[PDB]
Every structure is written in structure tokens, then in C-alpha cells.
Amino acid sequence: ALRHEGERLVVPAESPLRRTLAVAPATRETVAAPFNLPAMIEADPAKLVKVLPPLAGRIVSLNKQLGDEVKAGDVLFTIDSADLAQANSDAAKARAAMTMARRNLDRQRELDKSEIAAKRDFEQAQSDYDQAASESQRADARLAQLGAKGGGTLQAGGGHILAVRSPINGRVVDLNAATGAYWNDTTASLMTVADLSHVFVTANAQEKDLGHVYVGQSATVKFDAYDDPQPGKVRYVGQILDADTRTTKVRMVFDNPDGRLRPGMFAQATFLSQPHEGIVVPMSAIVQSGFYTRAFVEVAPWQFEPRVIKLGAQIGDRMEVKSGLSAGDRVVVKEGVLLND
Numbered sequence: 001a002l003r004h005e006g007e008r009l010v011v012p013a014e015s016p017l018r019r020t021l022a023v024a025p026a027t028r029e030t031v032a033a034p035f036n037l038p039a040m041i042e043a044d045p046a047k048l049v050k051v052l053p054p055l056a057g058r059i060v061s062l063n064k065q066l067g068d069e070v071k072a073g074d075v076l077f078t079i080d081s082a083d084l085a086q087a088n089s090d091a092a093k094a095r096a097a098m099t100m101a102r103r104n105l106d107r108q109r110e111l112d113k114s115e116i117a118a119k120r121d122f123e124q125a126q127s128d129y130d131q132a133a134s135e136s137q138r139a140d141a142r143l144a145q146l147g148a149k150g151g152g153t154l155q156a157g158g159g160h161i162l163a164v165r166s167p168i169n170g171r172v173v174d175l176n177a178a179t180g181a182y183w184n185d186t187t188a189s190l191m192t193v194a195d196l197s198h199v200f201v202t203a204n205a206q207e208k209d210l211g212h213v214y215v216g217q218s219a220t221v222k223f224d225a226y227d228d229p230q231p232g233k234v235r236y237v238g239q240i241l242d243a244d245t246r247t248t249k250v251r252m253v254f255d256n257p258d259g260r261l262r263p264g265m266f267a268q269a270t271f272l273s274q275p276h277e278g279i280v281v282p283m284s285a286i287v288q289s290g291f292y293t294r295a296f297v298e299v300a301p302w303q304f305e306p307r308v309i310k311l312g313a314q315i316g317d318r319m320e321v322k323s324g325l326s327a328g329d330r331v332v333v334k335e336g337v338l339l340n341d
């Protein structure tokens with residue numbers, strides 16, 4: 001009665017599970033798991049651009065339209081920033097005032113001096129100037145900031161109207177802007193240009209099936225709502241998990257000549273791992289407590305040690321233990337030498 005503890009678990013020599021416990025060495029065998037991954041269609045990250053405006057302002061026009069063809073670099077929309085209007089003139093004011101305010105000062109130094117001095121008014125002269133200068137210096141920077149943002153899309157004259165161009169060839173794939181509407185946000189994004197002649201079919205894999213993927217495979221992709229499955233080859237790859245989901249991206253590029261392949265659609269895939277010599281236990285041997293997962297190994301007769309393992313592929317009741325658990329260990333089957341009940 002019935003499990004004593006060191007950390008490692010000793011069974012008397014007395015106890016009932018002395019009948020019901022069972023063990024076998026851990027056998028290395030060949031594995032060639034077929035495995036299956038959820039996937040989604042994805043535009044080629046660019047290849048696709050959500051075009052944003054460089055500055056806010058009234059939309060003057062929408063050349064190009066949902067479905068319309070585009071070439072790099074057509075004009076897609078035009079913005080009347082104002083905004084940039086103000087700031088251009090304000091800084092015209094700002095400077096005028098200064099320059100004038102200045103030479104009003106300069107003509108008050110020369111009459112203190114030369115001949116005979118007049119009145120304190122020099123005092124206003126200076127305060128007035130110092131101020132107009134600071135304010136101009138202010139306007140100067142507002143223009144500076146703004147023009148740096150919308151300088152590359154300006155035309156000569158106009159109203160200070162920006163013309164945003166498309167940087168790549170494709171079709172207008174999303175719209176969501178109105179002529180006359182003011183656009184305040186950014187990104188925001190007035191439209192979306194894209195060339196989906198080819199798409200990514202991006203499947204996502206788990207640590208379970210991560211040693212089982214390789215650039216080079218060898219995939220069968222079955223969408224919905226398309227009955228007829230379709231072949232692919234993975235181009236990428238791995239190689240870091242996603243923290244939230246703990247999956248990694250495994251993507252294959254598809255031709256989309258029709259293109260019944262639409263970014264967003266769902267699919268599955270459908271792979272075969274290279275044969276490799278792997279170690280495998282029955283389900284009866286694995287136990288989970290949290291985010292783990294471990295088997296029990298006999299030491300020492302009737303003395304067991306926990307062992308943190310991971311894990312998969314499985315199917316059916318056989319389970320690939322990818323570490324470990326190494327060849328020969330007397331693993332239990334099993335079972336609840338982890339509760340005392």
C-alpha cells in the first residue's frame with residue numbers, strides 16, 4: 001500500500017498494482033506517418049499592396065475601379081490635402097510678417113544712433129520681431145513635416161493635390177473609398193492592388209508534425225468548395241512558432257490561372273514523412289498533466305522514474321515518442337502511477 005515516494009516511485013513488496021502493472025522495452029521501428037494540415041489561401045505578400053494616402057484630405061478622384069486592370073505605375077487616386085494648403089500660405093504669412101517686422105526694428109536702431117535718439121518703441125520693435133520670427137519658424141516646420149510626407153506624389157500647380165500611384169501590376173482587388181469623402185486614417189488604405197496569378201496555400205503545422213516537413217514535398221491539397229483534390233510542393237519551410245498558436249507556417253505556391261483559388265479560402269494537406277527509424281509506445285503508456293506529457297520508466301525492479309517526453313505522430317494506438325525515452329527503457333503500460341487512487 002501502495003506507492004512510496006522518493007520523487008521516483010517505489011512499489012512494495014506488498015501492494016496491489018504489483019499485479020496490474022505491466023512493462024515492455026521501448027522498440028525502435030520505421031515510421032512514415034501520413035499527416036494532415038489545415039491551410040488557407042494567402043496572397044503573395046507583395047504582389048499585394050493596400051495603397052495608403054501620404055496625407056489626409058478630400059478625395060478628388062478615383063481612377064481605376066473594382067476589377068479594373070492596373071500597371072505600375074498608374075495613378076489610382078488623388079487627394080486634395082488642405083492641410084498642406086494652409087501650411088503653405090501660413091508660412092508665406094509667417095515670413096512676410098517677420099521680414100517686415102525686422103526692418104521696422106532695423107529702422108529704430110539707426111535713430112537711437114545717428115543724430116538724435118527718439119522713443120522706447122524699440123521695445124515693441126524687438127518683442128514684435130522676436131515673436132514673428134518664432135511663429136514663422138513654427139509655420140516652417142509644419143510645412144517641413146507635411147511636405148516630407150506628401151512630396152513624392154505632388155504635381156506642379158493643382159491645389160496642392162497628391163497623386164498616388166500603383167507600384168505593381170495587377171487588378172483592383174478591394175475598394176472602400178468614396179469620391180468627395182474625406183480620408184483621415186492611415187494606414188486606412190483606399191484600395192487594394194494585387195496580382196493573384198499565383199497564390200500561397202499556407203498550411204500551419206504543430207510541434208507534433210514539424211520534424212515531418214521538408215522543403216521539397218509532395219502535398220495533396222483538397223479545398224472546398226472544390227471536389228477535385230490538387231497537387232503541390234512546399235517551398236517554405238519553417239522556422240519559428242507563433243507564440244499565441246504555437247504553430248509554424250508551411251507554404252506551397254500554387255498556379256491560379258482561373259483563378260478559382262481565392263486568398264482566404266480553406267483547404268487541407270496531406271503529406272508523407274520520409275521513412276526514419278523512430279521510437280513508439282502504445283497510448284496506454286503516455287500521460288498528460290498540463291502542457292506535458294510523460295511516460296514512466298522502470299529503474300530498478302518496481303522503482304519508476306517520471307520522464308518528460310514529446311511526442312507524435314500517432315495513429316492508431318501507436319505513438320511516436322520523439323524524445324525521450326531512448327531504446328531499451330522499460331516503459332510502463334501504464335498507467336496511473338501518477339495519482340494514488
Ligand SMILES: [Zn+2]
Nearest residue numbers: 031211278320
Ligand atoms: Zn518522426
